[PDB]
């Protein structure tokens, strides 16, 4: 559960919940009004509130005197289970979390929403058990809950299906059904009837399987859904995506073994165990030698993934491991080596002409080619002995992306990725095309979802649906945090949207 993150808290509430309704440890997070990207951890000790700074530009959050994460809620569990210090350096604990009853978030939500809208919507959009909670209209301040039941096999309105409106009563903010229980949320009350369904006396049970989606669309619809969202819109859809992330704390634990601890460019920024690329034919005198900062991302609703971090020093050689072992010929860079001074990715690549070995596996660099918002390597690699392993491998490497925020205008993404696409379209049984930032989450996470989202639409044309928080939902079940703001989630919609305007142009 995600029950601490307060959407629509100022800094002076904040202080106020943590010292009437909390106790020492007790703690919240929040986003700043204004600054987005800006996220703020209030936590009391000694029956005062601090405020910690967390910053994303786009790689990670930035904990301020704390470590780096992939998602608040890893962030949250890893300071639950350990090491959080003020500037003086004093042990600030996260012992108790202050949970928000604020419903605006929770994907069934739907806040004005009138009963004719909500009828409409679950008899076009809905199946039986989807469900959504909206204002009353005729009863102020209380709300409805809105349920379709039925046989999903017909296709036709033949009197199988049908909507249930229940009537939730707030009575001094707690929330009831008439009866029984009363809630302190409605997030409460929907948590509990979803495990303990409502039942009508003629044996109907309101079973509350799946919120309604409102956010699967047409292709051809995007451009409404983006004026739509324009009006944000936008700070809701990804906040909501943002609140399910509780529901990705799988296991990293062979990335946090001490022989893996170096192999990190940051220490709790982590491949989950169950995708993570397992290197096979090491060197039996390395004791762990089947690891590296990497995930496959698989879509699931024909090209795959990996989706990895800049290399380090002494993971160069692991990298190339890596490439040779999935027989991927196509390498996305996402970062310039070198930003604000700080080295984000090593040069893991000869210089143009020249040929290294990399442990066992050996590179020339063929030729490079340099376009406006990219560089191409024609890099040709093989096993050291073995001459027939050779194959190339394309370095797609994109020069110009901001060193904080998303690009203005998403053509040369666009571009680029379209360049990409046909290079690995051309190549016979090419494995996974591997993409990488600093981190391998943030830019990483953002290219591999336009790609997904711009492949659909390629292959099935403007009518085709697109679903842009469930793909993201996809890939971060498959490596943590992919997609880190909300800039890059909208950069992401703008993307689609203009790749969609440039195919009714040709
Ligand atoms: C309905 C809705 N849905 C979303 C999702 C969204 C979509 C589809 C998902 N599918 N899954 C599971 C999964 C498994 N694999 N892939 C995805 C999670 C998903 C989320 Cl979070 C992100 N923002 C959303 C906003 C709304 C509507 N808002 C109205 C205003 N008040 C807040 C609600």
Known sequence: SRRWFHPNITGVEAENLLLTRGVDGSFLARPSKSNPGDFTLSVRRNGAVTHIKIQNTGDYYDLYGGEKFATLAELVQYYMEHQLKEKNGD?????????????????????????????????????????????????????????????????????????????????????????????????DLVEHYKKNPMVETLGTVLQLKQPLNTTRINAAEIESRVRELSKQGFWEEFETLQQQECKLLYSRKEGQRQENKNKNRYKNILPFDHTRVVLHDGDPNEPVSDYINANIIMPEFKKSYIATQGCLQNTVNDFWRMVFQENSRVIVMTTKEVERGKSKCVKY??????????????????????????????????????????????????????????????????????????????????????????????????????????????????????????????????????????????????????????????
Not at 455 to 479: A, F, L
């Open 91 to 187: 042990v600030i604990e996260l012992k108790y979390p202050l949970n928000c009853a604020d419903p605006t978030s929770e994907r069934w939500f739907h806040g004005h929403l009138s009963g004719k809208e909500a009828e409409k919507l679950l008899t076009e959009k809905g199946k039986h058990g989807s469900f959504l909670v909206r204002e009353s209209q005729s009863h102020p301040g209380d709300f409805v809950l809105s349920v379709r039941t039925g046989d999903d096999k017909g296709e036709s309105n033949d009197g199988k299906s049908k909507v249930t409106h229940v009537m939730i009563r707030c009575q001094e903010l707690k929330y009831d059904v008439g009866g029984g229980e009363r809630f302190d949320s409605l997030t």
């Open 349 to 506: 690549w000869p210089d143009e002409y020249a040929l290294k070995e990399y442990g066992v596996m050996r590179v020339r660099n063929v030729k490079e080619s340099a376009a406006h918002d990219y560089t191409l390597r024609e890099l040709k690699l093989s096993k050291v002995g073995q001459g027939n392993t050779e194959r190339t491998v394309w370095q797609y490497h994109f020069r110009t992306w901001p060193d904080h925020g998303v690009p203005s205008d998403p053509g040369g993404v666009l571009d680029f990725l379209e360049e990409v696409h046909h290079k690995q379209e051309s190549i016979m049984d090419a494995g996974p095309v591997v993409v990488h930032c600093s981190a391998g989450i943030g830019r990483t996470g953002t290219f591999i979802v336009i790609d997904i989202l711009i492949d659909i639409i390629r292959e099935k044309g403007v009518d085709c649906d697109i679903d842009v928080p469930k793909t993201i939902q996809m890939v971060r079940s498959q490596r943590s945090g992919m997609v880190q703001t909300e800039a890059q989630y909208r950069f992401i919609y703008m993307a689609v949207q203009h790749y969609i305007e440039t195919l009714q142009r040709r």
